[PDB]
Amino acid sequence: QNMMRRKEQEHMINWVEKHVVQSTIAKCIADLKLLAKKA
Amino acid sequence: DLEETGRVLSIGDGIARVHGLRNVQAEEMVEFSSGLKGMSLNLEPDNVGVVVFGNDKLIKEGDIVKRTGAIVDVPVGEELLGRVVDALGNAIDGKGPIGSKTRRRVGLKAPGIIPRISVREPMQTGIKAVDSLVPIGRGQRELIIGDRQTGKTSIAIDTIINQKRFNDGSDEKKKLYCIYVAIGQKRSTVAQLVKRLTDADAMKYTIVVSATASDAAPLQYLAPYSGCSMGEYFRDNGKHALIIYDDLSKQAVAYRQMSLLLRRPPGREAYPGDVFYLHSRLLERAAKMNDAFGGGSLTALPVIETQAGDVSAYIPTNVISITDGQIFLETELFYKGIRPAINVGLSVSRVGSAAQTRAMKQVAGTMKLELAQYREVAAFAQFGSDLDAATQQLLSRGVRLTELLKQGQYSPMAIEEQVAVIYAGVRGYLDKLEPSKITKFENAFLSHVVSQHQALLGTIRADGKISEQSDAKLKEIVTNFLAGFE
Amino acid sequence: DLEETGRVLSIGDGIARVHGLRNVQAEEMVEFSSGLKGMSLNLEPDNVGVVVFGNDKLIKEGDIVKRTGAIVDVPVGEELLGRVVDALGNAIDGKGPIGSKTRRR
Amino acid sequence: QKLFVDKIREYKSKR
Amino acid sequence: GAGSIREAGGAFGKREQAEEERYFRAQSREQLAAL
Amino acid sequence: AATGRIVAVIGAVVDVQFDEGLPPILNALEVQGRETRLVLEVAQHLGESTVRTIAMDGTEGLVRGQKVLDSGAPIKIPVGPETLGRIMNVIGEPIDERGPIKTKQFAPIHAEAPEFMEMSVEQEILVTGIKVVDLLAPYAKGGKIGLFGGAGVGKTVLIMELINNVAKAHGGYSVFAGVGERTREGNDLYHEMIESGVINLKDATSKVALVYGQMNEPPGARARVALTGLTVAEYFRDQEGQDVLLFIDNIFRFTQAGSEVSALLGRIPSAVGYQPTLATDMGTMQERITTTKKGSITSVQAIYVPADDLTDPAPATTFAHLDATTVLSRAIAELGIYPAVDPLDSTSRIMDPNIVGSEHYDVARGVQKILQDYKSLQDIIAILGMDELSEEDKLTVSRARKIQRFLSQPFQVAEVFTGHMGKLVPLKETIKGFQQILAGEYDHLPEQAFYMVGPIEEAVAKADKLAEEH
Amino acid sequence: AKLVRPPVQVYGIEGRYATALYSAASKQNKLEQVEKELLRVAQILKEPKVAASVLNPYVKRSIKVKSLNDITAKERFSPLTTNLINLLAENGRLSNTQGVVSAFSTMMSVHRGEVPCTVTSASPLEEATLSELKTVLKSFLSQGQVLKLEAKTDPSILGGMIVRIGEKYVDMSVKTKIQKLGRAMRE
Numbered sequence A: 001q002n003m004m005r006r007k008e009q010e011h012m013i014n015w016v017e018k019h020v021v022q023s024t025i026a027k028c029i030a031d032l033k034l035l036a037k038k039a
Numbered sequence B: 001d002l003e004e005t006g007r008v009l010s011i012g013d014g015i016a017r018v019h020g021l022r023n024v025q026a027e028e029m030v031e032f033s034s035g036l037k038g039m040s041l042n043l044e045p046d047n048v049g050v051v052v053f054g055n056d057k058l059i060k061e062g063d064i065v066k067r068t069g070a071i072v073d074v075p076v077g078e079e080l081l082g083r084v085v086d087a088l089g090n091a092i093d094g095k096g097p098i099g100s101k102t103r104r105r106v107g108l109k110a111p112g113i114i115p116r117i118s119v120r121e122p123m124q125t126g127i128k129a130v131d132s133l134v135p136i137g138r139g140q141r142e143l144i145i146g147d148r149q150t151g152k153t154s155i156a157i158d159t160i161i162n163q164k165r166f167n168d169g170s171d172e173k174k175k176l177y178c179i180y181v182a183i184g185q186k187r188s189t190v191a192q193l194v195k196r197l198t199d200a201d202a203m204k205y206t207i208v209v210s211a212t213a214s215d216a217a218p219l220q221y222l223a224p225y226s227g228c229s230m231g232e233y234f235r236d237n238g239k240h241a242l243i244i245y246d247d248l249s250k251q252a253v254a255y256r257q258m259s260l261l262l263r264r265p266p267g268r269e270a271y272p273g274d275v276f277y278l279h280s281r282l283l284e285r286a287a288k289m290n291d292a293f294g295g296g297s298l299t300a301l302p303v304i305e306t307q308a309g310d311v312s313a314y315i316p317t318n319v320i321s322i323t324d325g326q327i328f329l330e331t332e333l334f335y336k337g338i339r340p341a342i343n344v345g346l347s348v349s350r351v352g353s354a355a356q357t358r359a360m361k362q363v364a365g366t367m368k369l370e371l372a373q374y375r376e377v378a379a380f381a382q383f384g385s386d387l388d389a390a391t392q393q394l395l396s397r398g399v400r401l402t403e404l405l406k407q408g409q410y411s412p413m414a415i416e417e418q419v420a421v422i423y424a425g426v427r428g429y430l431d432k433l434e435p436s437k438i439t440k441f442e443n444a445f446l447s448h449v450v451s452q453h454q455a456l457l458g459t460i461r462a463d464g465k466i467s468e469q470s471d472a473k474l475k476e477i478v479t480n481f482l483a484g485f486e
Numbered sequence C: 001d002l003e004e005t006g007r008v009l010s011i012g013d014g015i016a017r018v019h020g021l022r023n024v025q026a027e028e029m030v031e032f033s034s035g036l037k038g039m040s041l042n043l044e045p046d047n048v049g050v051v052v053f054g055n056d057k058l059i060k061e062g063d064i065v066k067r068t069g070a071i072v073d074v075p076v077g078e079e080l081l082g083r084v085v086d087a088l089g090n091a092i093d094g095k096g097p098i099g100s101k102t103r104r105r
Numbered sequence D: 001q002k003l004f005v006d007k008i009r010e011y012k013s014k015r
Numbered sequence E: 001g002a003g004s005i006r007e008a009g010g011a012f013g014k015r016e017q018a019e020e021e022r023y024f025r026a027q028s029r030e031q032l033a034a035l
Numbered sequence F: 001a002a003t004g005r006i007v008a009v010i011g012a013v014v015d016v017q018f019d020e021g022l023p024p025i026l027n028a029l030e031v032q033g034r035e036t037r038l039v040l041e042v043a044q045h046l047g048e049s050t051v052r053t054i055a056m057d058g059t060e061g062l063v064r065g066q067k068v069l070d071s072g073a074p075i076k077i078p079v080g081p082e083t084l085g086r087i088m089n090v091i092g093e094p095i096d097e098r099g100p101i102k103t104k105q106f107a108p109i110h111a112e113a114p115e116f117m118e119m120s121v122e123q124e125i126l127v128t129g130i131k132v133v134d135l136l137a138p139y140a141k142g143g144k145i146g147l148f149g150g151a152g153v154g155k156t157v158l159i160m161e162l163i164n165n166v167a168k169a170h171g172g173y174s175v176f177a178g179v180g181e182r183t184r185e186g187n188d189l190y191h192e193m194i195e196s197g198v199i200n201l202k203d204a205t206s207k208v209a210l211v212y213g214q215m216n217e218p219p220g221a222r223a224r225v226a227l228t229g230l231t232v233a234e235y236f237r238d239q240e241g242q243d244v245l246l247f248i249d250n251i252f253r254f255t256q257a258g259s260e261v262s263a264l265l266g267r268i269p270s271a272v273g274y275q276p277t278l279a280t281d282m283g284t285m286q287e288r289i290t291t292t293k294k295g296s297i298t299s300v301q302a303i304y305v306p307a308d309d310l311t312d313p314a315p316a317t318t319f320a321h322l323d324a325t326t327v328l329s330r331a332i333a334e335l336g337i338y339p340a341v342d343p344l345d346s347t348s349r350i351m352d353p354n355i356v357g358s359e360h361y362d363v364a365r366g367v368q369k370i371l372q373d374y375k376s377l378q379d380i381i382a383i384l385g386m387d388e389l390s391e392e393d394k395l396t397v398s399r400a401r402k403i404q405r406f407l408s409q410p411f412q413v414a415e416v417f418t419g420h421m422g423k424l425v426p427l428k429e430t431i432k433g434f435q436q437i438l439a440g441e442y443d444h445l446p447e448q449a450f451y452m453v454g455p456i457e458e459a460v461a462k463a464d465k466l467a468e469e470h
Numbered sequence G: 001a002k003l004v005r006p007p008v009q010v011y012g013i014e015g016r017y018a019t020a021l022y023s024a025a026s027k028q029n030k031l032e033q034v035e036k037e038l039l040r041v042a043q044i045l046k047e048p049k050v051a052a053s054v055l056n057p058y059v060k061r062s063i064k065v066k067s068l069n070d071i072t073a074k075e076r077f078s079p080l081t082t083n084l085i086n087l088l089a090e091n092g093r094l095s096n097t098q099g100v101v102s103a104f105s106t107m108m109s110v111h112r113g114e115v116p117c118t119v120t121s122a123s124p125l126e127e128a129t130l131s132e133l134k135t136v137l138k139s140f141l142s143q144g145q146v147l148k149l150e151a152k153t154d155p156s157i158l159g160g161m162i163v164r165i166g167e168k169y170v171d172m173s174v175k176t177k178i179q180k181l182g183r184a185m186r187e
């Protein structure tokens, strides 16, 4: 039960990361806002 | 997250010549863009020589190198007991992260002249030969030196297993926390060692720092200092630690690789000029603190593999000069049946009787004198039947005491039973018995004293000495068992 | 030319650092202007390291080195039977040339 | 909040 | 240095080997004939 | 992928300048415009977008400016059951004239060693049928063995006898890696494997994969062919769960190959003229030859010991990577005893009473002790002579010489060297025979009755025949 | 003789000749003039016939230094530039000259306070946020420096922007964040 839980949650964590790679001017603007927030 | 960086000018053999990084410190930990770590060993006018904590195939010319602003440090604390870690303290046994709270720099200086007190408390190994003839004290640096496959790791593992009697008790003054740094060994050898320590229930008070043969040279270089810091944590907090570097020859080889690749001037056997400085600043950290500093201690048991018994090599010479004594192992003694194959003539402990209990002192002074006389007249064996009765008596007592020192593997003895056995030996109660039975007797007798004579053993253990009542009771027990022995 | 032809940068102890010779191969036989032969053993960015098959007394700084295009090779066959030759196959027994039809690297 | 997009939208995706 | 004299070769190790072989070929003769 | 140009050719070292796309270290580059495939493995980034590389074949005929193409990966060799019965070189080309090796997957010859949590502590004795090995330093299933010896003491004969016995008794896809050895021995092994049925040129049920880079190869090929064979064995272990045998002969050459390029890579020499990176290279290679929880790899490695030193950095560094070392001695081979295994220098980590049983362990320790006592008595024998020894000591010397002869054994592969027949002694027979010699049960028999026999019954029969003759 | 060391250091033959020239020119207060003349002399050197004549190894250094001397006199250089070219020709470091030149150039590149800084992005970003980042970054500077931006574009970072301000380096890219929190979810 543990080993099946380990292989699975491992196959989950690399899925969900690989599945947003498939997925923004708001960010580019937010970056300069953060660079201003650096001070 | 604004970081000062540099470019990798070149990379090769685990050395990265890095541009920029104008404010990096000497021996500062940097981080490459691929996630790898490195240490700045050479600060040169136009570049920085970084040693890579890993595989250089992930580093390319032009990669960004960030600073971290910190000298290398490792987690320390009691949360490391029972764990197998790498040279940087990361758990490698898959039991989750190390929940430590404190971090300690691996390159801290040793205690000075004043924070120390003399080495006076015994560090029991459980090996009769060591505890009687080459006594080790808490705060000492005793070298285990010998050829390959002569039984050095076995001495370290017996010393680690033996501390279970003290770590399961309630006397907090006698508890010893063990640390086994494994440099340049196979991962399967370390797994066998960890399994052996778990079976003996010795892991709960032991840390195993593992920088194995496939780890980069900087990691094998750094592992002894990480282990020494983990032990300095205990030494500083009123507790007592023991550390075993297995072995320092491989750390010297790793440091020589790093130096030769950094183009540092080579010396004898291509070792850099500061390899003595390396081992000496590692070994001076094993100290015994005075009560004003908590009374803690750190005992170092460095291991050295000599080639063909040549103790005049470079690194053996250095570490023999640094330490407070040596336990020398011989392969000829090994195959003669003398195991542990300790060479008593060459072994030495410059602490000596100041690291023994009074009972072991009592029996061990006699045993040492008798074995010395035996070593003097031992060449006259093969002719013994044609000399005086005194020479034949010297030879007889010598071989009896020699067989008295043989001991099985992974079976360390309590100090009381060692004292009882050496008492039966050096008092003459084995002269009438012939040699081929001594070992057997030593077993049976032991069982006897363990079964029906817990009072005498407990009284010796509590007093630390053999008083006249203890002496007489031991006398009667020995003579009774000997008269009734097969 | 500087591709099929180079110029001796320096000569000493039977080693010639040669300029140019951009098309020379590793272990190729080159020919100095004096009639001597050499082998290109070090192909470096700025020069070629030629080992001279003879006495470097006749090679001077500035001499012209030409290519052969052939990696070092010697005559073979049965004509060599009975002959005394040097390392390059030239007869030294004073009996004339060797009628070899085949050359082997 | 790119990862925070990830963390919720993907655990939801696994759910 | 237990077999140092015969591991070094030389006269003292070549004479030891010869002596051993002499004695034990004698004993193997006086052991075979008694079979 | 990316294209560069050769800018320097010194020996087996080639510098390549890439304008765009510098390849990572350990990548394989292909030289363009060559008859045969020449591969350069990247070793260093020199700065100024130039990489230093080691050539896998000869560097003759290379021209400065010649085009070099980046493959984008390390040397990738074909792996799979199709490699069984085939011979490949360091870069995976078939060198048996039997056509291409149509596997379905390729593996890079550079990989990471198995982690610490992937190690297995199982120790199970592997009985070889050889008396001295099984008695004094027995091999374990899934362990690393190692055979040490100088030139001409019998490493190849012993590794071929091990091949014979174990591999023909095995069912797990052996793999042989010839690393910088004689090509004549490679052809010999190939044909004595074909004629033994272990390699089948038809009806492909072959059970051995061969990888060969021999003495005539450049230093790079001799340094990477061990990794190639290792990668074949690693595929058989991981992606198939099988139990693999991995024979390597000779592994010293691997080490030596590195030295032959070290100074040309711009590295200060270490001691005895060896690369500064000796121990770490040996580590990253040997730590991949291991049994994991996913499979098992029993590895026998012939280790050349230069000039019978055993303190040279190469054998001395190899010693700590093995589980059961077998050290062959010239002083023993000159006695006529074969195999020349040194009983007082061989070691096994399963020579433990809790593993081999107290009887096996006690017999082994008694044999070693009587041999050490014989050593100690030979000095007295040189000075006094034999006739002035104690009687207990004459008995010691007699039993010691008998044990020396009985450790000898005729091999099936040495039938031409000896004319004798091959003997495969079981384990219990070995323990029983040596116990009986140590007990005195054969004091009456001569010592030449134990020379080159199998079980002790053969010693008795040989003594009876030797007597019946004279 | 005490030197006037530049703000940034270059090493090697390039750095030595460039530091020698910088300290020379700072004593007579002619840095801008020497800089212009070095630009001009480098562009002269890149001429094909002149490059062929100065890189040639079998040409005697006497005729080579005479050629460089008179071709320096054909432009009416400063005594500092003339003496530098004469020193490079007399020492046989003419092949390094442009390096030296650029060294001095980069030296003065920091004397004018010009701080180099590159912004790598995924897709080529337009000028509005470019002036925005210009303004917000010139806050990162000390007394009197001006930005030298090089907006580079690699979509392998697939978002965010990696900003290298001189030797400072901020990683606002999305790949680094994804990998960081992925590691955190794995470790």
Ligand SMILES: Nc1ncnc2c1ncn2[C@@H]1O[C@H](COP(=O)(O)OP(=O)(O)OP(=O)(O)O)[C@@H](O)[C@H]1O
Pocket: B147, B148, B149, B150, B151, B152, B153, B154, B155, B339, B340, B407, B408, B409, F320, F348, F349, F351, F352
């Ligand atoms: N007291 C003993 N009694 C019997 N056998 C022993 C004893 N001590 C060690 N041995 C055995 O001798 C062998 C070598 O011992 P050990 O490995 O501990 O020494 P070592 O110097 O660390 O070897 P290495 O060269 O691999 O580092 C082991 O197989 C061990 O089981």
Ligand SMILES: Nc1ncnc2c1ncn2[C@@H]1O[C@H](COP(=O)(O)OP(=O)(O)O)[C@@H](O)[C@H]1O
Pocket: F149, F150, F151, F152, F153, F154, F155, F156, F157, F158, F338, F339, F411, F414, F417, F418
């Ligand atoms: N088991 C053996 N039986 C008989 N002769 C042997 C045996 N082993 C080695 N020899 C002899 O020693 C010689 C060398 O054998 P070899 O396997 O080539 O040793 P190595 O591999 O160390 O060079 C052999 O030709 C053979 O004559």
Ligand SMILES: [Mg+2]
Pocket: B152, B153, B154, B246
């Ligand atoms: Mg050990």
Ligand SMILES: [Mg+2]
Pocket: F155, F156
């Ligand atoms: Mg061989």
